[PDB]
Amino acid sequence: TSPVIGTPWKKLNAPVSEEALEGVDKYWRVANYLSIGQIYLRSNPLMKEPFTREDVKHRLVGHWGTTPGLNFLIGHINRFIADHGQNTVIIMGPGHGGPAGTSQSYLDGTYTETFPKITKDEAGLQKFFRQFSYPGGIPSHFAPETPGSIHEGGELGYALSHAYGAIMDNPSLFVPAIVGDGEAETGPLATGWQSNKLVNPRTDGIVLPILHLNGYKIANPTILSRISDEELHEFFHGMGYEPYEFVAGFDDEDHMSIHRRFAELWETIWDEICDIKATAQTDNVHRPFYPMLIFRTPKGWTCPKYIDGKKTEGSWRSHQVPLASARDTEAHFEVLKNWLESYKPEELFDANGAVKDDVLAFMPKGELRIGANPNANGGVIRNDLKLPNLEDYEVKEVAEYGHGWGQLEATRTLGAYTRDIIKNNPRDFRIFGPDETASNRLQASYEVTNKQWDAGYISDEVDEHMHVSGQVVEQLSEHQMEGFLEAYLLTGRHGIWSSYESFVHVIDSMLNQHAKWLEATVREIPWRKPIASMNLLVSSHVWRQDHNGFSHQDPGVTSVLLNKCFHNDHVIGIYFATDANMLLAIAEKCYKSTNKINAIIAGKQPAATWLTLDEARAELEKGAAAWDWASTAKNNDEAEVVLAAAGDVPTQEIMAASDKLKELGVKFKVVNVADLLSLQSAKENDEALTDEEFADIFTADKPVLFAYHSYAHDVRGLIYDRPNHDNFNVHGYEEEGSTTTPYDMVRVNRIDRYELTAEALRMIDADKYADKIDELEKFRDEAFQFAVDNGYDHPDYTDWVYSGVN
Amino acid sequence: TSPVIGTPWKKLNAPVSEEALEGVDKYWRVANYLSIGQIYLRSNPLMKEPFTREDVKHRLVGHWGTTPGLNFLIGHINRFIADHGQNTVIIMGPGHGGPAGTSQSYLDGTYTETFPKITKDEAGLQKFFRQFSYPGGIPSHFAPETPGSIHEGGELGYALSHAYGAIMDNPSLFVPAIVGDGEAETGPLATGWQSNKLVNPRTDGIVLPILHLNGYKIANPTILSRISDEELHEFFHGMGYEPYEFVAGFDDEDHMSIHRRFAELWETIWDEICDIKATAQTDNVHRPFYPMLIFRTPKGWTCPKYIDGKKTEGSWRSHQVPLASARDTEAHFEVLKNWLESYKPEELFDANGAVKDDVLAFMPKGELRIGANPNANGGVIRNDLKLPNLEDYEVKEVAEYGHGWGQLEATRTLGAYTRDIIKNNPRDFRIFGPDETASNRLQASYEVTNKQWDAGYISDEVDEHMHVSGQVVEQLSEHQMEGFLEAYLLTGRHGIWSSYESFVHVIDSMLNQHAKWLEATVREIPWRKPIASMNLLVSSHVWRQDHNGFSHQDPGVTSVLLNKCFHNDHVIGIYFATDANMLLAIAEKCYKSTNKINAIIAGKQPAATWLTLDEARAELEKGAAAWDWASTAKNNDEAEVVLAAAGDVPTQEIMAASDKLKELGVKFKVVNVADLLSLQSAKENDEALTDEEFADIFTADKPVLFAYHSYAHDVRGLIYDRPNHDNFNVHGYEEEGSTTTPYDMVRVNRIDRYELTAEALRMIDADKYADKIDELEKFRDEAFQFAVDNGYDHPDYTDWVYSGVN
Ligand SMILES: Cc1ncc(C[n+]2csc(CCOP(=O)(O)OP(=O)(O)O)c2C)c(N)n1
Ligand SMILES: Cc1ncc(C[n+]2csc(CCOP(=O)(O)OP(=O)(O)O)c2C)c(N)n1
Ligand SMILES: [Ca+2]
Ligand SMILES: [Ca+2]
């Protein structure tokens, strides 16, 4: 679970010391200098004679506009941390404020600790400035390469979901969450403000949202800075916050008055938070209004007010670089030089180029430093789950009655397994869902926990399984669920969320950003320890969406996740749960895995159970497997056709087609694919099937009929250099469907058992089986006409049991 | 432009008549009856003796919980429309309230008009009930098949973006926008409330948001119904709304008092809207507070209060069906029978099964009916754009100087073209962008229009190109931009939005839902006229994202859009703008197209111009084309290799590789692919290249080196059955990159000119060219080491001009 770090929720009981404020003002100057040096300078960091245009980088990359505001806030937060011993993680929402994050880590000493070549002297400072956003250096954003980041904030709008995920079951953790005022215009951010209705001030930590109201986004004003101050305050009060406003930099107040004013307001806010935390030790049934800070400052604060007659400080014109080419004109170089000198670096750095002791003597030390807090490197906190014994949940009836027995709902099995994970791993495992946990059949967890709800309660007739604390969280937002879980994992804990398949697409871009985090971490950031995997139960899938119908039918999550499978990163798992015993095997592998995004595509409809758990674990280790109990070919040369399937509904239709083929005497081989990346090119993926293993399973030369759960294009693209790939005939979802019966869903997508039987006969000999082929095609129209007439599927479809069942 | 319909913004100046309210109450009863009949009944709609369990559908599909609330609102809105002659489109946010939408269209007469077999008598009523969510019938949601829908509301959260898009440049249009209170938890909905800062009450219409606060989503309470009433009101007032609350159904108030109370509140709200509209004829500089309605009613209102001892009315238990199987138990059938009888259908329907005249005598008539308003079938409003003459914008310097001339930014050309579209098509064309219009270089439109901004103005030093009305709208939300545009198109107008490539993924699920709308429309809904295409400029793409770096590098929009290309729908266009003249040809085709989603992938970096406009139009008609001016093979049998490219940066690297190959004497053929679906299987796509056309371009048997803009998996999947496809060697984005130089981006993804030159020689003869191959690989490391040392790319890279340039 989360470590208790420091002395949390302590009031100061004194004014902020004038010395600490002189610390904060020097911090802001030197962090601003170091932010500018990283953007503009390739050499001569301390502007020794001669400082000329040759010291300027040839291409200016990075963002000034948000940066001096972030440096201000970070300076004051560091003072706060050292004075109070508070366990603190910062969410840098305007993540293009990269130079502030790297400057912080350089000043707190964690940068040189982590990156020993970047020393705390003039040659290390030169390397520090050159490397920023440079070929072979470090990124422009607050990337996972930076000590202290858990959030790159490249794609905007997840700051608050990540902040609130971080504090769940983390009652000593304080998260100051800096939100762009442009970022507050996004969808995901806008709903993220309501997360305070889903956290509990006793059992969870505290988020302080900080609205970086600098007035501007890239080229536009921001909505929230142009509405009235009364509207802006009512808005935050309507969302359960008590808003505090700070305004600075729009007049000629000296910088030391600003710091005193801010430290006074910070400590007032903090006294309000400590009151909330102290009250919650007794009463955590009544939701407080949490503080939030509206930080109103000019964009690009302390850049030159006018460059070439255009307003730059307090404008969108300061967003990227205020000064656009200091290398090309003497005039513009002089502006850069005077700007760099306005921070007076002669007082900040000593003769050797180290930042002076009195600049940083207010800073926190040890694990309380922003770049050294374990919650910001949450792999160091994370332990293996205590997992229950997987055979306790095994469907034993396959071994009793035969492969293909029963009408179980496979996700109920996962639900019972996850219930006992939650029971064995209190405060360490969570379930998230967008109001779909019961619907996706995971509600056995309510026997051991509750849905965390901190809005109003009204009646025990409606409010079953809800409590102000609990390990299940539901809000109708895929962005919230994915974002909560992502930060729960990045801070060292574990979990799962579930979703209807077609709505996974809502968070495709969040999955992309989590995968780029993971890809960069496993390629090049070894000091960042492995975090628990992002586990996604994909249920209510396309084949059993014949009640919501056509516009809820999109299995396309698989195509998205296949674009993050390169260079042996192995950060993606794509798993088709064939039945409940395969779902168990998959779930245990995903629950033991680290540094991944695991998609688990499982049906929740009643379906057969095909495998025992020991067979499921064997198929899962390779990824695909022949089912010799289902083949009537007895090796690869007497097979006429290979019937392969990936997914529970393709497996059902292929197994029903193999029974009709067997009745015709045909010699075939049956294959199941549980793990989709096992089919990936053996050159590209060293966990995938070797080409010899692939040709034993599939064959060297026989026609393979392949029923696939998602778009056939996924498979055709993956097997492009596999042996015998020209003989594959992939059937997937093909954008057909309506609100209809289950048979009609498989029929219109050409994956029903009769079409698959017919396709196998056309592949073997379309001419000797011509009579029986015309017979199967006529039945397809007749079983559809039965559904129209009677209101339910034809009994040859619905009553079918595999002949292996005794 | 939008038609002025009716007598807009007229006050009533009288109380609502008691007769009209008696109409509304009968409407609600019969719409509730017809909603239940559609869910439960397969036969005997008017429960003639004998009404037994055989009349009940075998499988119950659909949603009761939202429905009686929607029927209430729709009844009162119909009364409003007939009394005021207001041009009105409803957005049904809880779109799973399908039976309300179909019941409305059946009652207003537009259903039988559109669907002549569904007559207004007892046999038509039987067909009406059976067809709902049934095999071979109609969908469960408010689908495009329903007269009156412009929004299916399957995937939740776009109700307000669509409402506000609908009213843009539509000053007579009133849009009552019904928002689920669960739907209000989503990201896209939460930011959609701020859209009132982007509309102008003179030049645009009026949205009335209606929060369907029924207290419950699927299985949970809703956040907004469990916070305090003071918080809920402050929230809406903070977002620029004046909230009104209506509460009904939680006591024993008779239904006629409820209707009177509601009609009084409706007319008060409407008098406030008419005041806003009347004020805006004089002062449209000051943003009003728009009304909004909080409609607080029990979920499942008028269902039986308790079923089997569980609270059903006013619970999440009424969400899908209150009564779960009326076909299986005598007890549950009797509950259904008494429920159906509580509406007293004997007073609603006459002897023949027609709804009685006095039920519907309050209804609107003609084009003012919800299902007959042209804004709900916006293809009937839409005209061809007046498009300017495309040769006025042609880069003529290709013909002067040679193929490969210049350093133009291709999107500036599109920007000038779109400027003059806007100028020629006032109030008919809009640009949307998520604060990226200038950045994607489309800012020539500010010469003829402004960015529409209706929040506060502060200074001419920051507020350039902004006005309270204008044809460009910017908010930092891809959900808003995509959703605004989608409704502007569905109401008959035209436009374009632009985005950075990697953030297109933010709205993948909105693109999916628009594509399913389009797919269903072109397959089976001929009365729904073609709308203008959804045009998306995809710029700042993966190759020139070496300043934001790795986590902004995702070209994966192409893989998403390839999953919507089936069954000859042709609702997707995927276009790679090779240069500015190809961008013109693409843009004109997309601006003339109907019923599509067009992705236009164009670079905004300085690049060469390869084609004249007349050549670009020739390549675009087929989709791919050989470049005989660039080949040194003079037919297909003397080519040793085929150098193909799709995208401007792959084209640049392939053209630079062909110059180095030419210097070696190699005989090659150069191919450009502008239209990605031209490569799709000729069986699957009858607009794609025939197999004979494909083998003339690519060859029957030569090695094809293919540099592709996005993931190589897209292409490998598409060409799986094309001639010579085993000889393709696709190079795409392979998830490598950092913040770096442009050369280093192409180098790490194995698509740079030196690697491509080397791959061509390995494909031709890896053994005779072994010396020169080892030479090219060593230069790749040396040009990377140059960038590290100097800060900019090697001059052999940066200074290259194609030898065709004179
Ligand atoms: C989802 C998304 N769309 C677009 C962008 C491009 N972008 C980067 S910074 C930025 C402006 C950010 O504004 P704010 O949130 O206002 O940041 P700050 O001013 O503090 O720099 C935008 C639009 C983005 N990062 N994310
Ligand atoms: C983006 C998305 N996620 C999940 C769902 C599944 N879903 C359908 S209805 C529904 C509840 C809707 O609630 P509300 O908005 O509260 O609708 P109403 O009560 O009026 O039925 C949910 C979660 C959805 N439709 N869209
Ligand atoms: Ca800002
Ligand atoms: Ca609701």
Distance B316 CA to ligand 4 centre (A): 8
CA separation for the pair B298, B69 (Å, rounded): 8
**Token pair recorded at residue A47:** 């502007």
B277 and B326 both lie in a single domain:
yes
CA separation for the pair B443, B415 (Å, rounded): 7
β partners of residue A225? none
Q: Write the single-letter amino acid at A24.
A: V
Distance A94 CA to ligand 1 centre (A): 7
A573 and A697 both lie in a single domain:
no
Q: Nearest to residue A302, comparing CAs of A255, A345, A234, A365?
A: A255
| Contact yes or no for A481/A537 (Cβ under 8 A) | no
Q: Nearest to residue B13, comparing CAs of B234, B221, B189, B271?
A: B271
Rg (CA), chain B: 30
Burial class (CB in 10 A: 0-12, 13-18, 19+), B723: middle
B367 and B430 both lie in a single domain:
no
For chain B, helix (H) and strand (E) counts, in that order, are 26, 22
Count of beta carbons in the 10 Å neighbourhood of residue B3? 16
Distance set, CA B478 to CA A563, B152, B192, B505, B506 (Å)? 22, 20, 11, 9, 7
CA separation for the pair B750, B746 (Å, rounded): 6
Q: How many CB pairs under 8 A join A and B?
A: 381
**E-strand stretches of B377-428:** 405-409
Q: DSSP string of A572-625? A: EEEEE--SHHHHHHHHHHHHH-BS-EEEEE---SEEEE---HHHHHHHHHHSEE
CA separation for the pair A508, A514 (Å, rounded): 10
Distance set, CA A474 to CA A192, A471, B460 (Å)? 13, 10, 46
Helix axes A508-524, B508-524, angle to 10 degrees: 140
- B768 Cβ contact partners less than 8 Å away, ≥ 6 residues apart: none
Three-class SS state of B283: coil
B556 and B688 both lie in a single domain:
no
Q: DSSP string of A146-173? A: STT-S---SSSS-HHHHHHHHHTT-TT-
CA separation for the pair A447, A472 (Å, rounded): 12
Q: Could you tell me whether strands A405-409 and A472-474 are parallel, antiparallel, or unpaired per DSSP bridges?
A: unpaired
Distance set, CA A148 to CA A89, A109, A112, A359, A595 (Å)? 7, 12, 13, 20, 18
- Measured on CA atoms in the order A464, A466, A467, A468, is the torsion positive or negative? negative
Contact A143 B188 (CB under 8 A): no
Of B573, B595, B623, the domain-final residue: B623
β partners of residue A625? A672
Q: Nearest to residue A580, comparing CAs of A554, A600, A550, A552?
A: A600
| Contact yes or no for A476/A191 (Cβ under 8 A) | no
A644 and A587 both lie in a single domain:
no
Q: Nearest to residue B196, comparing CAs of B234, B239, B254?
A: B239
**Cis peptide bond N-terminal to A298, omega within 30:** no
- A97 Cβ contact partners less than 8 Å away, ≥ 6 residues apart: A63, A66, A67, A70, A142, A153
Q: Which residues of B touch A738 (CB under 8 A)?
A: 139
Three-class SS state of A566: coil
Where is chain B broken, named by the residue before each break, C–N > 2.5 Å? none
- CA dihedral B262→B264→B266→B270, nearest 10 degrees, is 180
Verify whether ligand 1 is closer than 6 Å to residue A66 (CB atom). Answer: yes
Burial class (CB in 10 A: 0-12, 13-18, 19+), B712: buried
Convert B222-259 to b/e letters by CB count within 10 Å (16 or more is b): bbbbbbeeebbbbbbbbbbbebbbbebbeeeeebeebb
Q: Nearest to residue A774, comparing CAs of A763, A765, A766?
A: A766
Give me the residue from B135, B232, B458 closest to A741, CB to CB: B135
CA atoms within 13 A on the CB side of B96: 22
**Which residue, by CA, sits nearest to atom 7 of ligand 2?**
B218
- Supply the DSSP symbol for B157: S
CA separation for the pair A706, A715 (Å, rounded): 9
Domain count, chain A: 3
**Token pair recorded at residue B569:** 């729908």
Three-class SS state of B74: helix
CA separation for the pair B184, B630 (Å, rounded): 56
Q: DSSP string of B617-628? A: HHHHHHSEEE-T
Q: Which residues form the domain of B492?
A: 398-623
A638 and A543 both lie in a single domain:
no
CA separation for the pair A151, A490 (Å, rounded): 9
| B663: phi then psi, degrees, rounded to nearest 5 | -55, -30
B135 and B283 both lie in a single domain:
yes
Phi-psi region of B435 (alpha: psi -120 to 50; beta: other; left: phi over 0): left
CA separation for the pair B151, A731 (Å, rounded): 31
**Token pair recorded at residue B790:** 């100097």
Distance A64 CA to ligand 3 centre (A): 11
Q: How far is CA A625 from the centre of its chain?
A: 31
β partners of residue A241? A290
Three-class SS state of A67: helix
Q: DSSP string of B324-390? A: S-TTS-HHHHHHHHHHHHHT-GGGTB-TTSPBPHHHHTTS--GGGSTTT-GGGSGGGT--------G
- How many residues are there in chain B? 806
A273 and A373 both lie in a single domain:
yes
Contact B139 A563 (CB under 8 A): no
**Cis peptide bond N-terminal to B50, omega within 30:** yes
Distance B93 CA to ligand 2 centre (A): 9
**Token pair recorded at residue B788:** 């590290």
Verify whether ligand 1 is closer than 6 Å to residue A96 (CB atom). Answer: yes
| Contact yes or no for B422/B445 (Cβ under 8 A) | yes
B413 and B499 both lie in a single domain:
yes
CA separation for the pair A693, A677 (Å, rounded): 14
Q: Write the single-letter amino acid at A59.
A: R
- Mutate which: B462, B558, B574, B743, vs A, most A CBs within 10 A: B462
- Supply the DSSP symbol for A109: S
Of B595, B623, B651, the domain-final residue: B623
- B702 Cβ contact partners less than 8 Å away, ≥ 6 residues apart: B636, B639, B640, B641, B642, B669, B724, B727
CA separation for the pair B712, B722 (Å, rounded): 16
Three-class SS state of A795: helix
Verify whether ligand 1 is closer than 6 Å to residue A298 (CB atom). Answer: no
Q: Which of B63, B96, B316, B506 to mutate to test the pocket of ligand 2 (most atoms within 8 A of CB)?
A: B96
CA separation for the pair B510, A734 (Å, rounded): 19
Verify whether ligand 1 is closer than 6 Å to residue A218 (CB atom). Answer: yes
CA separation for the pair B509, B155 (Å, rounded): 8
Q: DSSP string of A223-280? A: HHHHS-HHHHHHHHHHTTEEEEEEE-SSS---HHHHHHHHHHHHHHHHHHHHHHHHHH
- In the block, tokens 């000034």 appear at A64
In 3-state terms, chain B is what percent helix, strand and coil (to 5)? 45, 15, 45
A615 and A656 both lie in a single domain:
no
CA separation for the pair A646, A710 (Å, rounded): 9
Q: Nearest to residue B651, comparing CAs of B725, B576, B559, B547?
A: B576
CA separation for the pair B544, B647 (Å, rounded): 12
| A413: phi then psi, degrees, rounded to nearest 5 | -65, -50
| Contact yes or no for A690/A635 (Cβ under 8 A) | no
**Token pair recorded at residue A3:** 């470590």
Q: Which residues of B touch A138 (CB under 8 A)?
A: 739
Q: Could you tell me whether strands A472-474 and A534-539 are parallel, antiparallel, or unpaired per DSSP bridges?
A: unpaired
- Measured on CA atoms in the order A226, A227, A230, A236, is the torsion positive or negative? negative
| Contact yes or no for B409/B439 (Cβ under 8 A) | no
Experimental approach was cryo-EM
**Token pair recorded at residue B52:** 């037994």
**CB under 8 A, 24+ apart: contacts of A267-276:** A267/A12, A267/A15, A267/A16, A268/A244, A269/A208, A269/A244, A269/A293, A270/A11, A270/A12, A270/A80, A270/A84, A271/A11, A271/A12, A272/A242, A273/A9, A273/A174, A273/A206, A273/A208, A274/A9, A274/A10, A274/A11, A276/A201, A276/A206
Where is chain A broken, named by the residue before each break, C–N > 2.5 Å? none
Three-class SS state of B588: helix
Q: Counting atoms of ligand 2 from 1, which one is nearest the CA of A506? A: 1
Within chain A, what is the greatest distance between any pair of CA atoms?
96
Count of beta carbons in the 10 Å neighbourhood of residue B404? 24
Instruction: Give kind and range of the element (H or E) at residue B166.
Output: helix B159-167
CA separation for the pair A137, B446 (Å, rounded): 38
Helix residue spans in A186-228 (DSSP H):
187-192, 223-226
- In the block, tokens 């962008």 appear at B433
Distance B438 CA to ligand 1 centre (A): 14
Q: Nearest to residue B171, comparing CAs of B28, B309, B291, B6?
A: B6
- Supply the DSSP symbol for B285: S
CA distance B742 to chain A (A): 10
Three-class SS state of B177: strand
β partners of residue B803? none
CA separation for the pair B221, A455 (Å, rounded): 9
Q: Write the single-letter amino acid at A572.
A: I
Written in H, E and C, the secondary structure of A426-463 is: CCCEEEEECCCCCCCCCHHHHHCCCEECCCCCCCCCCC
Q: Nearest to residue A390, comparing CAs of A575, A617, A619?
A: A617
Verify whether ligand 1 is closer than 6 Å to residue A25 (CB atom). Answer: no
A424 and A292 both lie in a single domain:
no
β partners of residue A431? A472, A496
Burial class (CB in 10 A: 0-12, 13-18, 19+), B49: exposed
Of B570, B598, B623, the domain-final residue: B623
CA separation for the pair A386, A372 (Å, rounded): 27
| Contact yes or no for B647/B592 (Cβ under 8 A) | no
Q: Which of A64, A92, A183 to mutate to test the pocket of ligand 1 (most atoms within 8 A of CB)?
A: A183
Q: Which residues of B touch A42 (CB under 8 A)?
A: 791
- Measured on CA atoms in the order A647, A653, A655, A657, is the torsion positive or negative? negative
Q: Which residues of A touch B455 (CB under 8 A)?
A: 221, 223, 226-227
Q: DSSP string of A361-429? A: TTS--GGGSTTT-GGGSGGGT--------GGGS--THHHHH-TTEEEEEHHHHHHHHHHHHHHHSTTTE
A617 and A663 both lie in a single domain:
no
CA separation for the pair B57, B110 (Å, rounded): 26
| Contact yes or no for B299/B65 (Cβ under 8 A) | yes
Contact B502 A512 (CB under 8 A): yes
Distance A162 CA to ligand 1 centre (A): 17
Burial class (CB in 10 A: 0-12, 13-18, 19+), A795: exposed
CA separation for the pair B706, B725 (Å, rounded): 11
Verify whether ligand 1 is closer than 6 Å to residue B434 (CB atom). Answer: yes
Rg (CA), chain A: 30
CA separation for the pair B534, B376 (Å, rounded): 17
CA angle B673, B677, B679 (to 5 degrees): 65
Three-class SS state of A315: coil
Burial class (CB in 10 A: 0-12, 13-18, 19+), B622: middle
Verify whether ligand 1 is closer than 6 Å to residue A152 (CB atom). Answer: no
CA separation for the pair B160, B32 (Å, rounded): 26
